[PDB]
Ligand binder design. Structure first.
Ligand SMILES: C[C@@](CCOc1ccc(Cl)c(F)c1)(C(=O)O)c1ccc(Cl)c(Cl)c1
Length: 134
């Protein structure tokens, strides 16, 4: 109880850096990169007992995942990858690992001041996305 309190709420994207290069590293094709890169998603995070839900709404795609920390689940990503995901809490940071096709990417979500900072890493390439409260 109270594990992710500081994440819960409704958040809006305010900045993005290096996302196109991250998507390239992931394997995302041209047209999806262009439309996905334009998106300005809202992220809605909620907790009910042990179940965390992260919803993302944008003009590109609406997605929703619900999960228990440490417990793998199957996810279809906005770019239509079919991945095996595991999300854990490590020192206050939500760490989301996605596995598919012998590949892996990690998404870390952290509270920093009034922001929620999202770092997406694929091999040597990092993208940083900053969300503020809606
Ligand atoms: C980056 C992220 C979360 C992960 O999401 C990914 C990741 C890869 C790919 Cl290829 C993709 F399309 C989405 C965010 O927290 O900002 C996001 C959310 C929602 C949207 Cl709509 C977009 Cl574009 C990006």
């Amino acid at each position: 109880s109270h594990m992710c309190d500081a994440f819960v709420g409704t958040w809006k994207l305010v900045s993005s850096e290096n996302f196109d290069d991250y998507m390239k590293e992931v394997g995302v094709g041209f047209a999806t990169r262009k439309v996905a890169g334009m998106a300005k998603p809202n992220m809605i995070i909620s907790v009910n007992g042990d179940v965390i839900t992260i919803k993302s709404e944008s003009t590109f795609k609406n997605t929703e995942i619900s999960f228990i920390l440490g417990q793998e689940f199957d996810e279809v990503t906005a770019d239509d990858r079919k991945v095996k995901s595991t999300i854990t809490l490590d020192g206050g940071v939500l760490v989301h690992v996605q596995k598919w096709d012998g590949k892996s990417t990690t998404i870390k979500r952290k509270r920093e001041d009034d922001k929620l900072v999202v770092e997406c890493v694929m091999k040597g390439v990092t993208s940083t996305r900053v969300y503020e409260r809606a």
